[PDB]
C-alpha cells in the first residue's frame, strides 16, 4: 500500500498539496498516477507517467516525485475541486498496482446556505392501500451536514423514520430526504406532523394536519 | 476519445457467480488492454485483472483464482466472472483501458483509466453489485401534492423497490427546469424508497416516467397539480 495523509484543507483561490509515499520497488521505479473521484461518482485520471496530464486536464493540477515520495498540487482551488484522490503505481515483484487509501480534499471559503425543507403528505391512493409514507425533502443548504426530528402533536417520533446521507447536488450545495412510514390509521390518529431541519444551530419547521387533506 | 460502459445484474446470491459485460465503443478490442477494478464501500481500491491486446491475460493473486476475463473482438465486449461471492465481493465494479507510453529516460510503463496513443481518460462508468439473498421487486409510484393562493410543488413517490437503480423523467423527458431527483433510502421494510419534486410558479401537464430495469418494469404517472 502507498501511505497518504487521510484529510487535506485549502482555501479558494489557494494551492494545496498531497504526498504519496512508498518503497524503491514501487515509486522508486514505477510511472506514478493520480485518480479523481467526488463520493457517489465516478473515477477520473488526473496524471499519468509521474508528471503528464490526460487530454483535457487543465494545467493547475501537477504532479512530481523524489525518490519513494510522489506529490500532486493543485493551484487556484475550485468548489469541484472537492473530492477523494487515489495515487497509484506498479510494483518490480507482480503485476499488481499498488494503491494509496486516499486523501480527502476540503475547499474552505464557499457560501454558508441554509436548507430549503419540502413536507409532502401521503397520497389518497397510498391510503386506500391501508400505508402511509410522508416525504421532507431538503436541499440547497452547504455545509453539508443536517439534523433532522420528527414530531407529531409536538411529541418527537422514534419509530418508523429513515434519513439519507448529505449528497453534492449539481451546483455544489447539497440535498438529503427523510421518510416517517406509518399505517392509514396513525396517519388519522393525530393533529398534526412536523418535520424540524437544523442547519449551524437554526431550525426550520414544516407542518401538516390530516384534516385539511 | 472512448467509451466504455458496464452492465450486467446488480444482485447476485451468496455462494453463487457474478458476471458483467464491459461493453467498448469506438475502439478496436484488437488494439487496447483492457482490465477490472472494483471499490469496496468506505474502503481501498482492489485490482482484480487485464486481458492484454494479445490476448493473455493477469489476475490478482489474492482472488484464488475465482476469476475469469474473456473478450470478443468481434463484439467489442469483455467479460467477469466472479465465482462463490460473500458480501466482501459487495462493491463497485469498473472496467478501464491500461493505456502505455514511453517514460524519457526509464522505458515504458502503463496506467489503468488512459487510452495510448491519444492520452485520453479512459474509466467506465462504474456498476454497484450487493451480494444479497433479497428478491426483485418493483417498485409502487404515488402521486406528491403539497396542497394539505398557494405556491404547488408536485412529484413522485417511487415506494418500496429492489434492488436498485430506478431512473425518473417528466413528460418523456421535455421538463428538466424546476426538477430535483433525491438520492434513495433504504426503509426498514428492506426496500428502497426515493422522490422527484417539481417546483413550477396554465395548459402544463405534469406526468412523471419511472423506470426499473431490474424487474423490466415503466410506470408513467398523471400528476395533478391545481387546488
Known amino acids: 500500500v502507498l501511505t497518504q495523509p487521510p484529510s487535506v484543507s485549502g482555501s479558494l483561490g489557494q494551492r494545496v498539496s498531497i504526498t504519496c509515499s512508498g518503497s524503491?520497488?514501487?515509486?522508486?521505479?514505477?510511472?506514478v498516477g493520480w485518480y479523481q473521484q467526488v463520493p457517489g461518482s465516478g473515477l477520473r485520471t488526473i496524471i499519468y507517467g509521474n508528471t503528464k496530464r490526460p487530454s483535457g486536464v487543465p494545467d493547475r493540477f501537477s504532479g512530481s516525485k523524489s525518490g519513494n515520495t510522489a506529490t500532486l498540487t493543485i493551484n487556484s482551488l475550485q468548489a469541484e475541486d472537492e473530492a477523494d484522490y487515489f495515487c497509484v503505481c506498479g510494483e518490480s515483484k507482480s503485476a499488481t498496482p499498488v494503491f494509496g487509501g486516499g486523501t480527502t480534499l476540503t475547499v474552505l471559503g464557499q457560501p454558508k446556505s441554509p436548507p430549503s425543507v419540502t413536507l409532502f403528505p401521503p397520497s389518497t391512493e397510498e391510503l386506500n392501500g391501508n400505508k402511509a409514507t410522508l416525504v421532507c425533502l431538503i436541499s440547497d443548504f452547504y455545509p453539508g451536514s443536517v439534523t433532522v426530528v420528527w414530531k407529531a402533536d409536538g411529541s418527537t417520533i422514534t419509530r418508523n423514520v429513515e434519513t439519507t446521507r448529505a449528497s453534492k447536488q449539481s451546483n455544489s450545495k447539497y440535498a438529503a430526504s427523510s421518510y416517517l412510514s406509518l399505517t392509514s390509521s396513525d396517519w388519522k390518529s393525530k393533529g398534526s406532523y412536523s418535520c424540524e431541519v437544523t442547519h449551524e444551530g437554526s431550525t426550520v419547521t414544516k407542518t401538516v394536519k390530516p384534516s385539511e387533506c | 476519445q472512448v467509451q466504455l460502459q458496464e452492465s450486467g445484474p446488480s444482485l447476485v446470491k451468496p455462494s453463487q457467480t457474478l458476471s458483467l459485460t464491459c461493453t467498448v465503443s469506438g475502439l478496436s478490442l484488437s488494439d487496447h488492454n483492457v482490465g477490472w477494478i472494483r471499490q469496496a464501500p468506505g474502503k481501498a481500491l482492489e485490482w482484480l485483472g487485464v486481458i492484454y491486446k494479445e490476448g493473455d491475460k493477469d489476475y490478482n493473486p489474492a482472488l484464488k483464482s475465482r476469476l475469469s476475463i474473456t473478450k470478443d473482438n468481434s463484439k467489442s465486449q469483455v467479460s467477469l466472472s466472479l465465482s462463490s461471492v460473500t458480501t466482501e465481493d459487495t462493491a463497485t465494479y469498473y472496467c478501464?483501458?491500461?493505456?502505455?507510453?514511453?517514460?524519457?529516460?526509464?522505458?515504458?510503463?502503463?496506467?489503468?483509466?488512459?487510452?495510448?496513443?491519444?492520452?485520453?481518460?479512459?474509466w467506465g462508468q462504474g456498476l454497484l453489485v450487493t451480494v444479497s439473498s433479497a428478491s426483485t421487486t418493483a417498485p409502487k409510484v404515488y402521486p406528491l401534492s403539497s396542497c394539505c393562493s398557494s405556491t404547488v410543488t408536485l412529484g413522485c413517490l417511487v415506494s418500496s423497490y429492489m434492488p436498485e437503480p430506478v431512473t425518473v423523467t417528466w413528460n418523456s423527458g421535455a421538463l428538466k427546469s424546476g426538477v430535483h431527483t433525491f438520492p434513495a433510502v433504504l426503509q426498514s421494510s428492506g426496500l428502497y424508497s426515493l422522490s422527484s419534486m417539481v417546483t413550477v410558479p396554465g395548459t402544463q401537464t405534469f406526468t412523471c416516467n419511472v423506470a426499473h430495469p431490474a424487474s423490466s418494469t415503466k410506470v408513467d404517472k398523471a400528476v395533478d397539480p391545481r387546488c
Open positions: 524503491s520497488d514501487n515509486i522508486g521505479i514505477f510511472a
Open positions: 478501464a483501458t491500461l493505456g502505455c507510453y514511453f517514460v524519457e529516460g526509464v522505458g515504458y510503463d502503463c496506467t489503468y483509466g488512459l487510452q495510448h496513443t491519444t492520452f485520453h481518460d479512459a
